[PDB]
Amino acid sequence: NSMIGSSMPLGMMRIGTIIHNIEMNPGQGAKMVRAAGTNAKILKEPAKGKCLIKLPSGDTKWINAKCRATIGTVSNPSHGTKKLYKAGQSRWLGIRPKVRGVAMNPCDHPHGGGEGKSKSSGSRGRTSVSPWGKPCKGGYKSASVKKKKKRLAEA
């Protein structure tokens, strides 16, 4: 009897199930997967406090057994599918119009300038860069690779 909407610690949870609304620290409060209809999935139960979970990001983590979850995927699966159809919809949600790089005068974004469209060089030009010299394509992480690799190689 694993029934939908119910919660419990993972210690009373069986392998292969589907879950959402996990909490990272023991009882802190559900901060893991929460969005409209997105489902994690457990992978095993070694009785060492930890439980290996596969998250929607594809990657996986270990959560203490005394932590909790909610059976079944979150509600409302379509929201990730509904395509808006004008500008007013964004505006209502809260957005404002976002301006690109190659538009701004060079004084304002590293991609500026040009007499007509252009951004960077054929030798010099580094890549496409954020407003603060940080590059955004290629797999860039900016020395948070330290944190990533530490928490990974804890496996």
Add this chain to the structure above:
RNA sequence: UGGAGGACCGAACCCACGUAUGUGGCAAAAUACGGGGAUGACUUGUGGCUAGGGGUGAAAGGCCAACCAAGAUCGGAUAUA
């Protein structure tokens, strides 16, 4: 039967497209006649916030007290030339 629309025509309203006027003018940016949208990414009143290598920008090097590729005013300072 219903009454949706970043729907339509058109005053309030805002905005500022063309011509002519004016060019110590009525006015240090207006007027006449025509123009565009006109339930929406709307217009507005009130009061609060962001302050100069900074703000803010549906991005023009635009705007920040009538003159911004770095405000105003004091001071270094009778700067230098």
Add this chain to the structure above:
RNA sequence: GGCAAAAUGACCCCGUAACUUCGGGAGAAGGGGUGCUCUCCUAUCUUUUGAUUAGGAAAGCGGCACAUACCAGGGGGUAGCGACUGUUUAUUAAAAACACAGGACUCUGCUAAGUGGUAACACGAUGUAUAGAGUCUGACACCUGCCCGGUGCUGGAAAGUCAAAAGGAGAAGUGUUAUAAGCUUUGAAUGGAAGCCCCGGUAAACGGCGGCAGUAACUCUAACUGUCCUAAGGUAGCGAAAU
């Protein structure tokens, strides 16, 4: 440069094309009618008494003229750019500029990434990958070729190469002594993470995408091949174009 000026305009009726995303084009275009008088019937109307006001029949009646003044769309055919409504250089540029929903890539497992500050801390967000940030393009349809050699971004192997801290052992100054003790100066074999070096990965990352020389019963050109070079040698498509 038909700029301006002119003209069309209203209501009712007739009828209305290409095209298509089948919602629209569309007030498409193109026409007619519009006054008042009495009568008839119709409705309607309690504002009581039966008539009055409007509509639509049908007969007059006058004017050149009957939305008579004021008010009030010029329309059609076809390219380019942009999908459009929007926004912008207050106070010479409102556009093809910007945005825009739509698309892809990259980053983030939550003390989330990213941002402001020194720093607490705040935003992110009383949000949790169908989420948030950045980047390029810009509805829709058809589609999106080749190159990772360069710049960047990135994974990774042991090798050497390592800066500093760790520092052998020499040498040297001075000390009876002519050079032991001792202090001191310099040293200086090993030490050394990243990175450098190397091998990879990336083009909806920044970027680049060629020459020659012969060759057919008309020349031509070359379907054919020989060729030099690259990392790769411009595919679909388009084309004296905003080029």
